[PDB]
Design a protein around this nucleic acid. Sequence first.
DNA 1: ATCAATATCCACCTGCAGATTCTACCAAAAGTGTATTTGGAAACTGCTCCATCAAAAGGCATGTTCAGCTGAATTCAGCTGAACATGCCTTTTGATGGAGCAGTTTCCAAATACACTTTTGGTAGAATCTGCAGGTGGATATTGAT
DNA 2: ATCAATATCCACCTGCAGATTCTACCAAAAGTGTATTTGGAAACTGCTCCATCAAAAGGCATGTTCAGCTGAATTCAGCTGAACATGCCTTTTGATGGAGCAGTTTCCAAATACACTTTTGGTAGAATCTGCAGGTGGATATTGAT
Lengths: 92, 93, 99, 97, 84, 78, 106, 103
Amino acid sequence: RKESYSIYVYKVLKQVHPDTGISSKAMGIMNSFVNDIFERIAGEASRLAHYNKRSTITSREIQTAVRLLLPGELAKHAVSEGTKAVTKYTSA
Amino acid sequence: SRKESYSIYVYKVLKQVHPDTGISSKAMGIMNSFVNDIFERIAGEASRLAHYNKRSTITSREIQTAVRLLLPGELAKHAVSEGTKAVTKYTSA
Amino acid sequence: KPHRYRPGTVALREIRRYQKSTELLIRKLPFQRLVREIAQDFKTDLRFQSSAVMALQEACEAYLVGLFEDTNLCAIHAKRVTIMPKDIQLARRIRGERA
Amino acid sequence: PHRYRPGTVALREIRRYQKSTELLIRKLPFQRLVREIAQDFKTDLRFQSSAVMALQEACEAYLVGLFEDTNLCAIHAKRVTIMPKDIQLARRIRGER
Amino acid sequence: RKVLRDNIQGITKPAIRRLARRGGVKRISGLIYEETRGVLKVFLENVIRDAVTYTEHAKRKTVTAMDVVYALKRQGRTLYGFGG
Amino acid sequence: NIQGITKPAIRRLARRGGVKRISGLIYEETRGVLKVFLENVIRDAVTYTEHAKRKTVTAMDVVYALKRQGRTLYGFGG
Amino acid sequence: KAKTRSSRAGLQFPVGRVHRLLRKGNYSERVGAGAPVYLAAVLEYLTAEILELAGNAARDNKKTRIIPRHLQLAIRNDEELNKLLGRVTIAQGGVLPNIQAVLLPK
Amino acid sequence: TRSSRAGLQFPVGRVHRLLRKGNYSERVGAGAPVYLAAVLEYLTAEILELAGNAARDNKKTRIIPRHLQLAIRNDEELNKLLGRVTIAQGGVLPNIQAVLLPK
DNA sequence: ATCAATATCCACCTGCAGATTCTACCAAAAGTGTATTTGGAAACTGCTCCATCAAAAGGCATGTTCAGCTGAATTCAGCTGAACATGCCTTTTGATGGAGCAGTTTCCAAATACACTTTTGGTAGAATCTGCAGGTGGATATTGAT
DNA sequence: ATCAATATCCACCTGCAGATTCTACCAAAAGTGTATTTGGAAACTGCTCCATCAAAAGGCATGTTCAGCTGAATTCAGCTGAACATGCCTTTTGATGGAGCAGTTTCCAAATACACTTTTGGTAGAATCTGCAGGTGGATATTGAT
Ligand SMILES: [Mn+2]
């Protein structure tokens, strides 16, 4: 038991840089990263919920939130890959 | 369109420490905002310990340890006081 | 004479003064205007709650006054007695608003 | 004999530790310190060898950062030597004391 | 109505001065005024932006006080006295 | 005990920090802020260990109050 | 008859409004029983703490109606409260009358 | 696999479970778990491509902590997002005040 | 050491806009009688975690010296604070018109609950492997002297 | 700016052990199939709350002199804190072990969640009140000129 994001960061590492691998301690830093960002977005996403007497966290609440949480073009490109993934999952 | 507030409640607590004193509307305002803030800081902090401790329920215990963390100095000493007391009274009868 | 107060004497008198009161120093109409302008250039055709604007103003009037102290405490740190951009910029860096 | 001018080492020391990434404080006195403090909070405590790296990693980062901010103050007063003075200004600004 | 333009120059110099006295400053450098404006502008932008984002997410066209309050909270400028 | 954090060690921490010269007093004052730091972090951490009904201080315990304190740490739990 | 829970604890604040805002708050899946009380309590207490300190401010200033300022004064003068509401700002509050000694005459 | 329907590397399900089990809201939409997973991905992706470059710049082929910290505090944005995060074993970027330098 | 010249104080005043009371409806506590779970309370492994024990090896503490950095005292070019006067524009009060919150209603399109059914993701060996880590040999960066 | 003589980085090369990465497999989820509840979207539509104008007035913002005295450039020197080569002891570290103790389970008694039904306590008007904002003036300092 005691699960981690490990595999996933490693897969994505092997795409941007097939020739490169990562250290253990660094793998760890990365884990903490994902966790944190998650928490920040799910949080700001929850507020948007309660805030709007709404009772369900749509993807519209994830996005909009990410606009407030993520700065500059780091944000736009972020929203994109999101709209992307969602556009694809839905059709088929 | 009826929306709530702690208004009555602060006011009750005002004639209690200063019988012959009164509070302005704007102040009552600054008051509701305070209470709500704290109310969020604590339940929100205790919300964390629960997850942290793989516990499904926020007891009056978490609240406390949440108060410890959130309040500073005697304010928290004297704080936990009025509470443990209030809860010891409640349960009893 | 004509009766003139030496320099700085009135400045101190102003500090004591505005520190005893609590009225928003920026004149209201211009602040408002400025608010709509900035917000204009973000989302076209918005409406503003009378209270919304005051809120903004209350918050700003605030920030700046506080940024002004830190600034001041910085001017002192360099033997000076005149706040400057130099002083303001440090304060915001330590503050991290732009380190 | 050949002696190195003043502070020339300081610059050569600075580039070094900045090019490196190893906690500087000595591992044992720290952990020693840790337990002492923590002992005034609760008795007969035990730590994770890791929790101690956590308590050293953390501390050191603050200290390095607090210093950067202390420099920018000392420089700001036309000086070039961080004094207890420089250290408070930077702290009262951040909002610690 | 009429076009809004160069209004940041509406935050008069006398006013900035006053605001600085409540801060404690006794002697104000020349350049200060413009600097302040810049910094004030950057403030408002960040806050207004966020707020409006809360108006745009609630699908409303009017910016409410909460909208403002809610945002000032994100920037940790937690404000009291405008909507609980 | 705090005196364990030696003067030279401090100079190194200072060095990385971008400091070229250093008053003689710093050292005492540096140790000061250092204590206060560890003091606030550890205590908030203990409370966690304690509330947890446990008797040993885990990595998290640190990490957690490390967050409550604004100073957020990566690479030690998550 | 009927005992308002707030009465069992002998508090002034609504223990039941506190239970309710807690459950539907999502802070947790299930809410304890004395949790709503204990909290209404801390809240009552803290509420009467900044109250009194401000009333006096009204008294110091020869007024019988507590207004923002007084509250601000009350907060920024008690080391502890000043602390708890560090990153909080009171609309109309003003600032503590404080001049940097170096700037004063001589 | 739900995650494949979106062509993402990060696990969509894990996230959907992490949301319903987070006390975030009473009920979670389907778009959310995915959108987020992608957003989570994209960002770790961003951090790596930029650390890779780091490692390659050192002559190493293995990403250590310092390789991350360099990529982070050198990208204006990433520095903003993680402004209040500290990396263990990262150090600082080599910067010395011009006024301290000789001449 | 005196005196005007002003600005700060402080108590008395008095109508009125901002509380303080006075009063009805009704959403939300409270009271009950079930239908779950939750979280300890004994019982017990395997960790990790103290602690003892035992040698070198840096790494720290000293005590010498003095280069050059921080402070104190002058000086003055001139920047910024204090007045004054000119007249522009922010207030203050009131009125309309209606854009657009909000409160209902109504209900699909979407999310939730079990009972199973499939694979994946985390472990603990098993098979590589990149640097740590030394060790010279070659400019580099410094520092003192013509 | 060069000349030389220390001391320094710094590439170049290079070998194996602590790690990294790769395997080989088990429960724990993640994913389906069906069958339920619902949130909150769409279409009115009542109606505050917000946008705009007017008008007259006086409250400031501007802009211009003038010069007091603040910031800044110098100069000087006592002495503090960097560089060092010395001498010595406290961190390093390497296991080794016994055991304090995080953690697992397995029941279950106590404490929650539920689903309705009365029964208040709170919220949103009007009816009455009354601190205290804005003026008015003498009394006191508090300044700045002689
Ligand atoms: Mn515009």
